[PDB]
Amino acid sequence: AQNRTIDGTDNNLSHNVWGSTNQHLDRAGPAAYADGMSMPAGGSRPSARAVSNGIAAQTGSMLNDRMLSDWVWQWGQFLDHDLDLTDAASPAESFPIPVPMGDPFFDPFNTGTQTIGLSRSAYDPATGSVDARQQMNQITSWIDASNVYGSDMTRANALRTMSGGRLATSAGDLLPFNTGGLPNAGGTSPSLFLAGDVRSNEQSGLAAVHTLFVREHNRLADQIAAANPGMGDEDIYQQARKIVGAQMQIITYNEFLPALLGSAAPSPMSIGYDDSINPNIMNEFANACYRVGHTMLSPTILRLDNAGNVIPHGNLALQDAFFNPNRIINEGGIAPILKGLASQAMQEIDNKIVDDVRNFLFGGSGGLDLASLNIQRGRDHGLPDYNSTRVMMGLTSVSSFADISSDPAVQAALMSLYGTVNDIDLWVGALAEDHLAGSSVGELIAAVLGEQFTRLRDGDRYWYERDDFFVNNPSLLAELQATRLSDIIRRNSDITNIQDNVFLIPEPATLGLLMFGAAFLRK
Ligand code: HEM
Ligand SMILES: [Ca+2]
Numbered sequence: 045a046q047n048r049t050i051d052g053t054d055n056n057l058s059h060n061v062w063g064s065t066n067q068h069l070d071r072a073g074p075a076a077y078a079d080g081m082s083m084p085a086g087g088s089r090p091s092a093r094a095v096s097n098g099i100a101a102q103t104g105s106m107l108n109d110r111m112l113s114d115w116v117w118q119w120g121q122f123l124d125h126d127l128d129l130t131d132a133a134s135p136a137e138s139f140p141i142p143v144p145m146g147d148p149f150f151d152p153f154n155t156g157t158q159t160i161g162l163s164r165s166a167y168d169p170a171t172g173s174v175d176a177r178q179q180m181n182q183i184t185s186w187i188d189a190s191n192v193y194g195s196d197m198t199r200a201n202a203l204r205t206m207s208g209g210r211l212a213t214s215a216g217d218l219l220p221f222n223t224g225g226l227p228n229a230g231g232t233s234p235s236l237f238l239a240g241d242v243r244s245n246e247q248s249g250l251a252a253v254h255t256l257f258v259r260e261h262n263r264l265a266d267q268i269a270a271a272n273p274g275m276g277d278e279d280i281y282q283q284a285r286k287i288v289g290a291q292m293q294i295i296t297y298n299e300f301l302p303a304l305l306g307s308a309a310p311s312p313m314s315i316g317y318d319d320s321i322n323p324n325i326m327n328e329f330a331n332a333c334y335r336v337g338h339t340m341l342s343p344t345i346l347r348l349d350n351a352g353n354v355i356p357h358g359n360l361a362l363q364d365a366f367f368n369p370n371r372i373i374n375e376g377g378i379a380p381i382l383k384g385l386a387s388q389a390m391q392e393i394d395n396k397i398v399d400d401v402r403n404f405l406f407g408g409s410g411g412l413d414l415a416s417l418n419i420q421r422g423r424d425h426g427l428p429d430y431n432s433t434r435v436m437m438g439l440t441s442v443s444s445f446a447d448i449s450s451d452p453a454v455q456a457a458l459m460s461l462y463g464t465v466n467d468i469d470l471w472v473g474a475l476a477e478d479h480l481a482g483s484s485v486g487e488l489i490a491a492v493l494g495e496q497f498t499r500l501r502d503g504d505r506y507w508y509e510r511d512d513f514f515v516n517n518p519s520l521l522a523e524l525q526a527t528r529l530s531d532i533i534r535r536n537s538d539i540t541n542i543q544d545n546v547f548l549i550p551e552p553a554t555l556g557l558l559m560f561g562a563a564f565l566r567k
């Protein structure tokens with residue numbers, strides 16, 4: 045059958061570049077650069093770090109109220125790494141975040157001169173001088189498992205064995221090592237994993253789900269070859285790839301979005317192929333509204349055995365999970381994490397980000413604040429303010445801080461940071477909204493996510509329901525439709541006791557009762 049390109053071209057048969065690598069991020073409406081060119085938006089607002097301090101600071105654990113597991117954010121990130129990537133422009137354009145004088149984490153010597161580093165995002169070089177700067181998406185916009193296969197044929201080929209349609213692995217059926225020194229977040233070291241997306245080593249949970257899908261690909265490839273001998277490597281590879289790409293769509297629209305968006309989730313079925321849809325990820329989605337992962341993040345990733353015990357090498361502190369393959373290689377493999385993610389409730393969706401990523405220090409000595417980066421990134425990308433974005437999406441504009449949040453502490457923080465509802469950073473406003481009834485997000489986030497996911501459903505010629513391969517093999521289409529993330533976890537690991545919907549935490553008594561007779565209580 046027809047197969048997707050690796051680069052996302054030739055999906056839309058008129059604008060063939062649409063959805064492909066290196067396309068512009070779309071915009072919902074006009075950019076808000078101060079000068080209409082490249083000068084950052086939000087130049088009247090406080091420091092991104094002052095905003096982080098004033099509204100994202102979290103002193104205690106705050107569980108979500110909809111029973112959602114850590115799988116919601118882990119899938120969210122994995123799927124993000126299928127949708128969009130924008131690295132730094134080169135030559136580097138520095139746009140540092142001023143640290144408030146006396147900031148207890150980043151300026152404890154009261155210098156008044158500390159910054160958090162940020163280089164401005166890559167953009168189309170034909171933009172940003174005489175017209176608005178348009179940032180580039182460096183992976184395929186399509187939900188096509190480019191996070192497994194790569195977004196260029198060179199990397200895609202590097203990931204393959206070229207025998208039996210398979211993807212390379214390392215010892216213990218783990219991701220292959222980057223021995224060829226291809227581009228990779230964390231650098232070109234051969235001791236880092238190589239996956240379809242360059243960010244796979246970012247943290248161990250991400251790496252674990254990347255590994256899972258390499259396992260699933262190889263299972264499919266082996267079984268296809270077994271059932272259909274005489275088929276060549278290329279044919280087996282493309283068939284397994286097409287099944288895995290369909291799985292990404294099915295899990296995303298049937299499990300993840302219903303979990304996160306709830307009442308606001310878009311239909312999991314396409315209304316039909318609309319080739320007029322721009323599938324290029326929207327800047328305001330990629331670089332604000334879909335960055336709702338950071339507020340969900342838990343301080344620890346649980347690592348559990350089949351009895352629900354913490355494994356001997358302990359749970360994994362989020363900070364210990366960054367750019368370190370050994371957490372998987374030497375501390376129990378992927379199975380404990382896959383189970384663990386299903387077994388803990390994520391943090392609430394709100395302005396608050398855990399200290400583990402808001403105040404990640406490397407040694408005073410500098411470090412990482414994901415809240416500050418997100419805020420500055422939205423100013424780098426010329427994103428419209430929160431309220432303008434509401435109007436861009438056909439929502440009413442707010443006219444008071446009470447219109448944003450019914451929490452008086454959130455109201456007060458927004459007031460004392462911004463002074464007017466019309467100059468709030470999109471990411472901050474979006475996360476400040478009261479949640480829709482039956483949802484874990486507010487109206488703006490619902491609308492922006494709803495829009496993006498509607499486009500990628502109806503705008504993709506290889507949306508799985510209309511791929512000739514699945515149309516011509518209805519039994520496979522049906523088996524795909526009945527496939528959940530838990531099924532993939534189970535058949536590619538040694539996990540025996542996991543709930544069928546890994547996006548929802550299990551009944552409170554589950555771990556205790558499974559532990560009975562085998563409980564390890566010293567962890
Ligand atoms: C441990 C978990 C996570 C880590 C460590 C992490 C880290 C990062 C970092 C460092 C960036 C770049 C920040 C910047 O300089 O602008 C980023 C970007 C992003 N993150 Fe997160 N993130 C996590 C979870 C999530 C989740 C759960 C989601 C979505 C549900 C998400 C969505 C995004 C998106 C959309 C971007 C922009 C991606 C691009 O287009 O380049 N992240 N993440
Ligand atoms: Ca993709």
Ligand SMILES: [Ca+2]
Nearest residue numbers: 339391392396
């Ligand atoms: Ca939170």
Ligand SMILES: [Mg+2]
Nearest residue numbers: 206207277278
């Ligand atoms: Mg070949």
